[PDB]
Each structure stands twice: as C-alpha cells, then as structure tokens.
C-alpha cells in the first residue's frame, strides 16, 4: 500500500519511468496475493491512472478495457474513485458526467490536506474546463496548482504541463503574447529536464497558440520541431501534428506541400486508429477536391458532433465557411458559419 | 484545436 | 458627518433608494472626508441609475480627477470599477476590480464582501462569463440570505443568476430565479422593481423562443409609470419591436415605434437608437437600403463596444437574410456574430 | 440583450 502510494506520487510527478517501475514491482504483490479489498480497489484504480499517465505523457494508446467500463469506503479511495472516473469521462468528451464526478471529488478534497494532491486535483479540473474553453475558471484552478508546484521540488514536469494549460487559457482569451511566454517557460523546463519527447509535445501545443494568433510560419516551425522527435512521430499524437500542418498549409494557400503531409496521415492510420482526426483530416484535404467536397465535410462535421468534439466543429466550420465564401457558395458558407455558432453555444451551455 | 498532454 | 456618510453608504448597500436619497439631502450642507463625500455622491447616482433608471450625471468625479484610509481607497477603486464597467471599458474595470479585491482582503465586513462580489458578478455576466459570475454571485447570495434587510439585494442577485443561466442554455432554471426575484419585489410592495424584473425576465423568454411570454412580461413592465419615465423604457420598447418582428406581428409595431420617437425626443440613447433602427431596417423593402441600415447600426455597436448587441442582432439579421434567400448577406452578419462573440470572450487587456 | 438594474 505504501508502494501504491509511492507509485501514485510518481504519477503525480508525471515521472513515467518511475511509474512503470512501480507498476512492474507491485504486480507480483497483487497476483492473487493481497487480500484487503480497499487495497485491491486502490491497485485497480492506480492501474487505470497509470494507463492515463502513459497516454498523457508518452502518447501510448489507451487500453480498450477500462475498470470504469463496469465499476462505477476509505474517504481517500472514494476521492480517488471519483477523480479517476472524472478523468475517464473527460477523455471520452462526456463532460456532463465528468463535471459531476469532479464536484463530488472536490467536496471530499476538503478532508484531504496534502498540498500536492490538491494541486493535482485543480490541474485536472482546470484541464477539463480548458477543453470547454472555460478559460477563466480553468485559470483560477490552474493558478492554484502552479503556486504549489513552484514552491515544491520534484514537480517541474507538472509545472510545465500546467503552464501549457495557462497558455491555452490565455490563447482562448486572445492573450497570445502571454500564451507564448507560458509555453516558452515550459520549453525551458523540459530542456533542463532533458525530456525531448516532452519538448516536442510542448512545441506542438505552442503551434496551436501561434495558429490562433495567425502566426502561421511560427506555427509551422513549431510543428517541425515537434515532428523531428522520433518518439513523437511514433505516438498517438503524431496525427495531431499532421492535421495542424495541413490546416495551416491550407490556410496560407501552400497547397503544394499538403499531399506530402497527407500521405503521412495514411501511414499513421495504417497502424493506429483515430476516427476523430480521420474525419478532421478528411475535411481539410477534401477541401482541395465541389459538391463532393461539401458532402465529405458534412460527414466529418456530423461525426464530430456525434462524439461531442465541438471545438473541432467550431474550428473546421470556420475553415469550410471561408472556403465556400471564396468560391461564391454563400448558402453553404452560411450553413457552416451556423455550425460554428451552434458548436460554440453548445460548448458553453452544459 | 485543443492541446495535448494535459 | 462620518456616521451619516456610513449610514448613507449602508443604505446604498441595501439598495434603499429612499433612505439613500434622504441621507444625501441631509448631508449636502476640507479634508479627506471631502473625497469620501465625493465618492459617495458618485455611488448614490449609480444606485439611482441602477434602481430607478435615473440618468447618470454628465460630469463624473472620476473623469477628471488625480494615500488615505484603506477604506477610502477600496471605495475609490470599486466605485471607479463601476464607472468603467458601465462605460463598457471592461479592461479598465477588471483592473480596478482586482485592486479593490486586494484591499477588501483587509476589510472584515461580510456585507461589504457581498457588495463587492455582486458588482464583479454583474460585470462578468455582461461579458457572458457565466460560470465566473455564478461563483461570485452565489457567495453574495449566501451572505444576503443569512442577513436581514437585504431582500432587494437578494432579488437583484437572482437576476444575475437568472441571466447567467440563460447564457448557459438553462432557461427553466433562469425563469425560476426571476420568479423568485419577482415574489420578493411583491413582498416588498415595490412595483417599480417588479416592472424592472419583468423586463429582464422578458430577455430570458426571448432567448427561449417563448415569444408570447416575452411580450406578456414586457407589457407588465411598461404598465409601471416610473418604468416609463426611466432610461430603461427604451429597452422594453426595443424588446417589444424585436419580438413582434420575430413572430411577424408587424401591424402592432407602429404603436411601439411611435413610443420610441417620444422617448428619443426627451432622452438621447444612441445605442438603442441603432438597435431599433436595425429592427426597422429589417422591415425595409429595398434590399440595398435594408442592408445599409443594418450595417450602420451594427458598426456603431462595435464602436461603443456593445458586442452582446452585435452578437444578438447579427443573428437576427442573418436569419432575416436567410429567410429571404440573401445568403451572401446572411453570411456577412453570421460572421459579425462570431466576431462579436469571440471578442466578447477575449480579454485582450487583462 | 443584457439585463438592467444589476
């Protein structure tokens, strides 16, 4: 159980190398051996959390089997159960349930005095709220996490990750310079840490801020630095870079370089399945084809509504609308102009 | 676009 | 004098306009207190504007001014935050609010805290920053709910809650809040307040496509003689015209349009002049004239930074053009709606 | 439309 707590400490530090060593060492201790049911639940909860960590930081695919698929009294194990399920629902874009599961965990957190645990909770709530572009709420939470992380040693990876949430929140607030500063500070931290995969990850996310600031060459240059890392290209997040490439290339009209990145998307999808980004890439590349283009865009937009990826609907509906406007297809331009409003209003409702 | 790794 | 001034300020924190008006008349007959009196004279006028719809003086103590008691400084920054908030200079308002929030950390009055939070919550609701506004106002409501003499502040706060719910697509919960506020004003025997709350409730009905409820609420508002003498009368008249337009009851608009001309004859209100002009421009039969009227009104609303009106009316103009097959123009104002909403969500100053 | 009196 102390081993379990040490393992969770390593997860709370985003030390995937320690985390995987704890996971390998605790597995024999849990081979039909350990008897205490709350410890068995703790081990079952930490196994899920560890897989979410490996996905978050190493870009390793999440297992199809979750202990949360079918499991829904220590006041700690209950906080952990609600927090780790909020993360599972948050990743599935089931934000209604996630918000409820978070609020229950927040209530229990009143009885947990560990400062790192509190910073850990706030940083997960801030991440979900940022996914909804609830920027001020996310900042108030993450600002508490950063205060704690800066004053305690061993949480430099957590400070860096937190700064990326701040930067995106700033970008969602139109504060692109402050958003860049946050990502740059995160980049310095990761180079000090000598974590080149993390550095690639931060460059990819920074490219979102540059793109939102219409700093397209900086956006493309940041993506180039990310994709230079081999681990990044082998990760599930490679497709995110390829998609941002195509979209920024299309935005600036450098269509002659788009088939290059598009062909790499096919190689990604040959080995890894990602239906959200398949739809998103199909929408971007299909804009190069008129009526066929619109029918493909309607299918992709419809799938993104279905899986509740409203931020992508908002993003791509603006791009389709601009495309149709430029080609004199005003009825279709308005139709996707309206999808962008609908996606945004639905995102803010809850 | 939403950021990754958070 | 100092006790009279604090009693005068207490009456403002209770929204007791009659007491406040009596204190002001009693104190009207060269120290730091002169700043205190000048600060309270501004606050009193803001109260009379807030609660009776009496025009704000043309010259403010704040437009052309230049250490003291920790209270007089908190008041200076709070009351100037209110002055900048009403002028839609929200960047400055937010900055002035953060300064007052810090000084409030050394003020132990719970009612003062409820007063502060309720002004911050009102500003964030103006920006459709619904969750942040709710966190602030919910704290104020608890303080008001546990203290005697603050029934008007509880009612006013419920209108902020209700508007926040309407901005979140929670129209039933928003209606509940306004109804609870209306009951309070009937208990209070405050028929002007009841008219004011009905006007604001009419915004929720309009957002819920409950047009007949919207018109019924506006009818109850404008029946009050004091409401009709207030600056807010034009808001109801505008909400009437807009809702009559949505349902196609064009024959009843000349009645209310004639009322707007009588209002503008006595009071200047270029914001609602533009807004009513847009409604009227939607009735114009010449396409070219119609669109230029909408462009003039929308562009003027950008100029005075009333982005919520740009968002609202651009959707109305866009729908109008859509029904008439003018898809190029429907898109033109569809784009204005996105721009206004994204800028409203942005805080490029803070 | 924004409400009045708040």
Numbering used by the authors:
A (entry chain B): 10 to 81, 88 to 304, 307 to 367
B (entry chain E): 501 to 506
C (entry chain A): 9 to 37, 45 to 81, 87 to 370
D (entry chain D): 601 to 606
Please quote the authors directly.
Proteins of the RRNPPA family are the most frequent pheromone receptors in Bacillota and use small secreted oligopeptides as pheromones. While most members of the RRNPPA family act as transcriptional factors through DNA binding, Rap receptors are specialized members that exhibit the capability to develop their function by interaction with specific protein targets. Binding of the pheromone produced from the propeptide, which is named Phr in this RRNPPA subfamily, induces Rap receptor inhibition. Our results reveal that distinct maturation processes generate multiple mature pheromones, which bind to receptors with varying affinities but produce identical structural and biological responses.
The Rap-Phr system from phage phi105 caught our attention as its Phr (Phr105) carried 2 identical copies of the putative mature pheromone (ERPVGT). To comprehend the interaction between Rap105 and its predicted mature pheromone (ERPVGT), an MST analysis was performed revealing an EC50 of 34nM with a Hill coefficient of 1.41. To further understand the recognition by Rap105, we solved the structure of Rap105-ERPVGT (Rap-Phr105) complex at 2.5 Å resolution. Rap-Phr105 complex crystallized in spatial group P21 with 2 Rap molecules per asymmetric forming a dimer with similar organization to the observed in Rap3T and other Raps. The structure of the receptor showed the classical architecture of Rap receptors with N-terminal 3HB domain (residues 1–67) followed by 7 TPRs (residues 89–367). Analysis of the pheromone’s binding pocket unveiled Asn220, corresponding to Asn226 in Rap3T, as the conserved Rap Asn that anchors the pheromone. A further 16 receptor residues (Q65, S142, M145, M146, T176, I180, Q183, D187, L216, I223, Y252, Y258, Y292, K295, D328, and D332) formed direct contacts with the pheromone. Pheromones in both receptors are well anchored by their N- and C-terminal ends and present an Arg in position two whose side chain shows a similar interaction with the receptor, mainly through a salt bridge with an Asp residue located at identical position (D187/D193 and D338/D332 for Rap105 and Rap3T, respectively). However, the pheromone Phr105 shows null or weak interactions through two of its 6 amino acids (Pro3 and Gly5). Also, the presence of this proline in the middle of the pheromone restricts the conformational freedom of the peptide, while in the Phr3T this Pro is a Gly that increases pheromone freedom and mediates interactions with 2 tyrosines (Y151 and Y225) of Rap3T receptor.
